Amino acid sequence: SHMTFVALYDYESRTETDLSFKKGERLQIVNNTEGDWWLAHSLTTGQTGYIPSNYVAPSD
């Protein structure tokens, strides 16, 4: 079970409830990793929103 991920690519929000993030940011799961859109909190920027699961990998 993984709850901390690292952005592989820059992501710009496409709807307001998305989280924008830059490559290399650490992103903390708020609830769970079910489905394709995960509610996450950036440990870099402090912002919270949905992230696309294919843009991140476990912080290894």
Binding site: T17, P52, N54, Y55
Partner: peptide
């Protein structure tokens, strides 16, 4: 960068 998954 890949296309997004199916949107909410």
């Amino acid at each position: 960068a890949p296309p997004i998954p199916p949107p909410r």
